[PDB]
Design a protein around this nucleic acid. Structure first.
Lengths: 169, 159, 220, 296
RNA sequence: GGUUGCGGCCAUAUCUACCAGAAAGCACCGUUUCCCGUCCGAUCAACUGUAGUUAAGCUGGUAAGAGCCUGACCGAGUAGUGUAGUGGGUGACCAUACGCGAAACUCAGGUGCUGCAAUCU
RNA sequence: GAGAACAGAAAUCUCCAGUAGAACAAAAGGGUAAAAGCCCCCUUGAUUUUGAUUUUCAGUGUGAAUACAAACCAUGAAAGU
RNA sequence: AAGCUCGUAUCAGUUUUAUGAGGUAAAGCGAAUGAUUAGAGGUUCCGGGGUCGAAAUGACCUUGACCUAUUCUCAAACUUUAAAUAUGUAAGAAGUCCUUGUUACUUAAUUGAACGUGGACAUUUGAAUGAAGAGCUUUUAGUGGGCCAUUUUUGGUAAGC
RNA sequence: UUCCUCGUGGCCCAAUGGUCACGGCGUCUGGCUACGAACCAGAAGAUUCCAGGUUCAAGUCCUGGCGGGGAAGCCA
């Protein structure tokens, strides 16, 4: 009973939350640019804390979205790092997952000492076909419960490909 | 110390009729107002332009002018020992026709029809409105509906 | 300090409660409103004796506390702590004011008399109507003569006239005594903490059964 | 599948529903008011709007006025009717939008009586121009574009239909800054590019480009053209002949209905579900109480 | 009768959980040369009805469903109120006379109707 | 609420719910959800002329506001504002 | 006070019929905002304190909030609801209907809007009761310290306040 | 009772709304001294009287309470 109730990768978000702005953040932008092939986007701070040393609208972090074959490619080459081993958490109740890595030279990227070393947060968000019903302008609707993405279904999918597992409880 | 502004004492007046907020329906805007037409004034708090003063809430006037978005209404306001003629310029969101006049005009058509019918079939029009008259001599019947006798009841607390 | 209660007996002013406009009020003397075997199933105590006002007036927090204490002590002395559930079915929310003129020698250090006479909070009072229930008890049917005397002794600590009526209906609930017995035998009742939940004919049948397995079960 | 949500009785009690068309997601009443509200000093002059809508596999252009009872249609034109003018394939494209605009224009103008005058552009070269008013004669029919919830972008087929209606004879007020060929850095329209977008220049150019870049695609797409013996350069002639036929006779011959209304209704009622009654509900409840807790 | 576009009244139309949907139409769906817009062809834009599906949306049905609507000698002629008295009462307040008259509670029923145009085994 | 390395009660990213429980310079009240709010684009109608009307009211003044007229402009595909 | 124009016109400190508006009293708060009494059941890795534990998204108790269903009592500056009294308009001759003219306004349009010609409908001519006349103008005096009673109501313990 | 003012490390005192806060004394450590003071070097010590709100940020800005001090209380 899966003609079109199949589970595909909606998108993969690569996030790098540098604590503050400057050449560090330009180097992170170069990282994500040379990684994906897209131009990243620099995200600002909402409010001020000072225990972290940030103030409003300081351009604190960067991120980029990837969709399709490029996304699954980046996923597998960055999940070989995690050894195809993930937790039973790291999986949301909405059928999405994610994992953080350090030292992104683990993914086939040469050092380029002008750039340095940066960690990353991968977050993969899923959807069945027919997600346009929520994201479109006209006749914007909601998705049926039979069609929703679940932790269980996402886990079964993540097992039935990559031949991976759900270690750590 | 005191406060006597335009929208003073207008909390509940221009409050917005529970579960009927926002987005006034368009029959409001498609209605048609000719000169010499009777209109009741009922403000809308969602439309702040063209409002009436609170005095004219619930008042009823006659149209004297019609414009792009508004109509002009003649009201009569009591000031001392005279009535003064007041001319408001109100947007149509704050306005609606009078079913009273609509009913009177229906009654006019009916009176004309009855008069023509009586001219055709026999005079004795008799087409005024009389008040509720006293009721004539009826005869009830018992027929199973026997009189059920009642009595007062004593004091009980049931607390 | 604390001028008498004849100055504040009657409902002369509108209700003036503690709010964002009237802050800075004192705290009520009465804080305990339910005492006795409060953790008692409804089947333990069928009787009930209400203390009911016949006058429209105000009652001080002070008087409510005094009456509570007198009643409770008579109960605990005669029948024990676990023979009654006294409930105070009226709450002091109405704030009473003083203007507080000077009494030492108010000739020159005047307070300007009735100028700026709006008063500061003096105390609290409960606003009471005719027929309004005060001081319910819910005992067993064998402690009637004890609770009636307790309430009669409490009745001296209130102004007005406060009569004592012997109620029906398992008196912290509604539902007259035979009707409650019909429901209790037909299994239309679940015992919540100190009070009952009833079976209706409106809800979803799944949860109605999973809350009331008994009602139409052929076993019972 | 999540019961932490739990819309409570209070929420449901003081929830205000939007208008039905807003719940659906089909009408912006802000736009509707500011498009339908008429100058009250005209008193019954209907404000005519050209509603252009794009489903998948169909364009819908219809002329509409408003009333307290409901909107009222003066004329309508659909793209599934273009086959009688000689357009079988690509009938949701920019060119079919142009043709549908021309069709609804000439259809209205015919049934209204103005078609002899205000014949619009019969020498289409993609030039910005509005239907001027004939002195010593009536004024042109005025009608305002209702897009709806569609986004305004330059190069779009709502504006193709608008261009077609304006060239067909209706006075459709518009600027030229959302047609294709609008140079952005310097504000000037490109009529040769616009004429290509009318006569399928971008479609035919893509076909030619796939005829030497990749033919597998060209085969899976564009299959109807290969079936119907169509190459790239026939497309301009096709659309030109179609425009000429539309200007010749737009009078809307409808279809034959082939097992008509009552047959249709019976066939539909065969599969539609009737509701229930109170006796049936009580019976269902009785059975459910005898089943669930009865345990046989 | 179903569906689409545009609507009127704006929950008898919403919400929660399940079950069906023939034909047609919507819809999801396929692609990125051009117009166009994005961190991203997801949205928006354009091109194909071609590669496929009714899974979802949508439509309807069910639920001693929540909510909403209607009605009633259900509460209740109750509370409250206009008018009256050299009426009762220390008073607080109360009754009576001539009138008007609720809300909650209870019970029962219902759960979108409809206009213009077009199309459909 | 559920999730993602450093990252924790609060940093940035993703999803679900969310009739407003937020924001709209400032009192309080009203009003507002494909908005009147947040972001972006373009702008100066915060222009000109001189009258009428509403409020306060003596039916005077001032202030404030309303709806039109003749122009000139902005914005928008446009209706319109 | 002077009068003027007219002689049932149109009016009225009133009702009725129709149609509006209102947010006080009452009522409600197992309905939003707030205040508020008491128990019941769940919830934590995601509060703290104890027993067993070298530790363990380790086993069990204590209180803490949080959630669900219930329960008692309230609101001048809260409210779904919502009176009585009081209040607006109308009840037609300056009316209704039919034909058709003027325009620089308006319309896609001799379509509308406004004003008209001509014609038809009168003595139940369009509810009640009354009308010691109706309408209009001029000029001028004194007054511009108020007080009491019923009822509504603010301050104040209250007051012949 | 009205008004004015102040509340800061054990003590005294200051602060631009812009670093979980300057000085001086006391305390502590070490060193000079046979020893203690004095001196030389260095350290620790703060929930800015309490409760709220404004602002990105309050010691500071706004309201109330608590304590200390001061002025006022006249005509008869």
């Amino acid at each position: 009973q899966n003609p079109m109730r199949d589970l595909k990768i909606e998108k993969l978000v690569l996030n790098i939350s540098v604590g503050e702005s400057g050449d560090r953040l330009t180097r992170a932008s170069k990282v994500l640019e040379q990684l994906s092939g897209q131009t990243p986007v620099q995200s600002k701070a909402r409010y001020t804390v000072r225990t972290f040393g940030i103030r409003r609208n300081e351009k604190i972090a960067v991120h980029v979205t990837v969709r399709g074959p490029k996304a699954e490619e980046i996923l597998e080459r960055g999940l070989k790092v995690k050894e195809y081993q993930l937790r039973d958490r790291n999986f949301s109740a909405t059928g999405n997952f994610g994992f953080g890595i350090d030292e992104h030279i683990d993914l086939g990227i040469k050092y380029d000492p002008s750039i340095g070393i940066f960690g990353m947060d991968f977050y993969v968000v899923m959807n069945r076909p027919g997600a346009r019903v929520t994201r479109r302008k006209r006749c914007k609707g909601t998705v049926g419960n039979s069609h929703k993405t679940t932790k269980e279904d996402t886990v079964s999918w993540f097992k039935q490909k990559y031949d991976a597992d759900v270690l750590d409880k | 110390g005191k406060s006597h502004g335009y929208r003073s004492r207008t909390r509940y007046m221009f409050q917005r009729d529970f579960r009927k907020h926002g987005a006034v329906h368009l029959s409001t805007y498609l209605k048609v107002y000719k000169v010499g037409d009777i209109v009741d004034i009922k403000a809308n708090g969602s439309i702040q332009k063209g409002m009436p003063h609170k005095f004219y809430q619930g008042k009823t006037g006659v149209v004297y002018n019609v414009t792009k978005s508004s109509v002009g209404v003649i009201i009569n306001k009591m000031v001392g020992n005279r009535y003064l003629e007041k001319r408001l310029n109100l947007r149509v969101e704050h306005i609606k026709h009078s079913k009273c006049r609509q009913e009177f005009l229906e009654r006019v058509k009916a009176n004309a029809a009855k008069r023509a019918e009586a001219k055709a079939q026999g005079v004795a029009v008799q087409l005024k409105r009389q008040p509720a008259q006293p009721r004539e001599s009826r005869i009830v019947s018992t027929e199973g509906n026997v009189p059920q006798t009642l009595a007062p009841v004593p004091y009980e607390t049931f607390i | 300090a604390r001028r008498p209660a004849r100055c504040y007996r009657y409902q002369k002013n509108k209700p003036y409660p503690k709010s964002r406009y009237n802050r800075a009020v004192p705290d009520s003397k009465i804080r305990i409103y339910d005492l006795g075997k409060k953790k008692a199933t409804v089947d333990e105590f069928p009787l009930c004796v209400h203390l009911v006002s016949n006058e429209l007036e105000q009652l001080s927090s002070e008087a409510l506390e005094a009456a509570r204490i007198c009643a409770n002590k008579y109960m605990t002395t005669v029948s024990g702590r676990d023979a009654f559930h006294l409930r105070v079915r009226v709450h002091p929310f109405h704030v009473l004011r003083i203007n507080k003129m000077l009494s030492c020698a108010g000739a020159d250090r005047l307070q300007q008399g009735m100028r700026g006479a709006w008063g500061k909070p003096h105390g609290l009072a409960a606003r009471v109507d005719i027929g309004q229930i005060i001081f319910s008890v819910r005992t067993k049917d064998s402690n009637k003569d004890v609770v009636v005397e307790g309430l009669r002794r409490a009745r001296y600590k209130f102004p007005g006239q406060q009569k004592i009526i012997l109620s029906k209906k398992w008196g912290f609930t509604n539902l007259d005594r035979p009707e409650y017995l019909k429901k209790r035998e037909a299994g239309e009742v679940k015992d919540d903490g100190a009070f009952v939940k009833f079976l209706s004919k409106k809800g979803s049948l799944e949860n109605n059964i999973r809350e009331f397995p008994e009602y139409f079960a052929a076993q019972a | 599948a999540f019961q932490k949500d739990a819309k409570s009785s209070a929420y449901s009690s003081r929830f205000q529903t939007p208008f039905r068309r807003r719940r659906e997601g089909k009408t912006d009443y802000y736009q509707r008011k500011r498009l339908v509200t008429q100058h009250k000093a005209k008193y019954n002059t209907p404000k005519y709007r050209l509603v252009v809508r794009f489903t998948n596999k169909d364009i819908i252009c219809q002329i509409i006025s408003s009333t307290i009872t409901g909107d009222v249609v003066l004329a309508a034109a659909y793209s599934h009717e273009l086959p009688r003018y000689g357009i079988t394939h690509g009938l949701t494209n920019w060119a079919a939008a142009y043709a549908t605009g021309l069709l609804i224009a000439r259809r209205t103008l015919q049934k209204l009586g103005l078609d002899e005058t205000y014949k619009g552009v019969e020498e289409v070269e993609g030039e910005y121009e509005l239907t001027e008013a004939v002195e010593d004669g009536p004024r042109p029919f005025k009608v305002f574009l209702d897009i709806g919830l569609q986004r305004t972008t330059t190069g779009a087929r709502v504006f193709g239909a608008l261009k077609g209606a304006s060239d067909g004879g209706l006075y459709v007020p518009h600027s030229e800054n959302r047609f294709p060929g609008w140079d952005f850095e310097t504000e000037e329209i490109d009529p040769e590019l616009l004429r290509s977008y009318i006569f399928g220049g971008h479609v035919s150019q893509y076909m030619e480009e796939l005829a030497d870049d990749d033919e597998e695609r060209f085969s899976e797409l564009f299959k109807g053209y290969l079936a119907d013996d169509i190459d790239a350069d026939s497309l301009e002639d096709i659309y030109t002949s179609a425009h000429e036929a539309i200007r010749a006779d737009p009078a809307f011959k409808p279809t034959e209905k082939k097992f008509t209304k009552e047959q249709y209704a019976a066939e539909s009622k065969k599969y539609r579900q009737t509701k229930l009654s109170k006796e049936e509900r009580a019976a269902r409840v009785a059975a459910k109480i005898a089943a669930l807790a009865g345990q046989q």
